[PDB]
Amino acid sequence: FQVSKHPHYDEACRAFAQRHNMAKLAERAGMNVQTLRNKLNPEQPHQFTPPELWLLTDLTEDSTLVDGFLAQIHCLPCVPVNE
Amino acid sequence: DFQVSKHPHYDEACRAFAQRHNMAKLAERAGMNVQTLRNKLNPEQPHQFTPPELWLLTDLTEDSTLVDGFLAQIHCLPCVPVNE
């Protein structure tokens, strides 16, 4: 695995802020709304933690953050499995 | 979908990753403090890796233990490379 040139995670972060209401999502996740914007802003040094990435993915049922996380290291998107 | 699992998948991967690799040698390659680097892999400590930190360590070690545990904590199969 090698880190890519194209910012796949940065484009996944900007797109995640596009779809969801940041005020409502930050409240449900118990996050300061400005800190959530910063961790989604590739212009700011704030970054998500693994527990934060799972929580936001769980509440929204959207894999944008995780899929962009995987493409940066050339992994295909999450393929879930149940049972 | 994408629900959080109650098993410590990412935690157990952090322990296995920490045991497999020398922490001092990885810290000087990754440009991190060796004590901070252990804290991220110690589940009993609240320190966590940032997304750039996980890509770098996966790059330097060519070991997908942390990424696969990251995927397993929310019910994703292990990483399948793109391979150009």
Side-chain angles (χ1 to χ4, degrees), chain A residues 3-20:
Chain A
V3 186
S4 171
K5 298 187 291 180
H6 177 243
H8 294 272
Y9 184 67
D10 294 338
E11 283 321 283
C13 284
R14 304 171 192 269
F16 191 85
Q18 166 81 292
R19 314 198 201 194
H20 313 298

Side-chain angles (χ1 to χ4, degrees), chain A residues 3 58 61 74-76 78 80, chain B residues 1 3 59 75-76 79-80 82:
Chain A
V3 186
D58 188 10
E61 286 190 298
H74 298 70
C75 293
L76 296 177
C78 176
Chain B
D1 215 358
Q3 306 298 279
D59 204 318
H75 304 108
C76 307
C79 163
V80 170
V82 164

Side-chain angles (χ1 to χ4, degrees), chain A residues 1 3 9-10 47-51 53-55 57-59 61-63 66-70 72-82, chain B residues 1-4 10-11 48-52 54-56 58-60 62-64 67 69-71 73-77 79-84:
Chain A
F1 314 98
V3 186
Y9 184 67
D10 294 338
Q47 306 275 15
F48 285 126
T49 66
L53 279 169
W54 311 324
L55 179 61
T57 314
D58 188 10
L59 306 164
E61 286 190 298
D62 178 21
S63 53
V66 171
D67 295 338
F69 176 86
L70 296 165
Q72 202 60 40
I73 55 173
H74 298 70
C75 293
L76 296 177
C78 176
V79 170
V81 296
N82 300 9
Chain B
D1 215 358
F2 309 102
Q3 306 298 279
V4 188
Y10 175 78
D11 280 344
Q48 296 297 337
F49 281 121
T50 59
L54 282 168
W55 311 328
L56 172 72
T58 315
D59 204 318
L60 297 178
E62 317 197 80
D63 184 12
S64 76
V67 175
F70 182 91
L71 285 148
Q73 200 63 47
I74 58 200
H75 304 108
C76 307
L77 296 171
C79 163
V80 170
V82 164
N83 290 103
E84 286 295 323

Side-chain angles (χ1 to χ4, degrees), chain A residues 1 3-53:
Chain A
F1 314 98
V3 186
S4 171
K5 298 187 291 180
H6 177 243
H8 294 272
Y9 184 67
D10 294 338
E11 283 321 283
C13 284
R14 304 171 192 269
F16 191 85
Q18 166 81 292
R19 314 198 201 194
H20 313 298
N21 207 17
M22 297 288 99
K24 172 169 185 196
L25 177 59
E27 189 185 10
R28 309 174 59 216
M31 269 166 95
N32 175 29
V33 67
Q34 189 47 62
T35 312
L36 172 66
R37 305 191 205 271
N38 295 331
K39 296 172 175 244
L40 284 155
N41 187 7
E43 279 160 341
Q44 298 265 20
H46 311 66
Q47 306 275 15
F48 285 126
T49 66
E52 284 172 345
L53 279 169

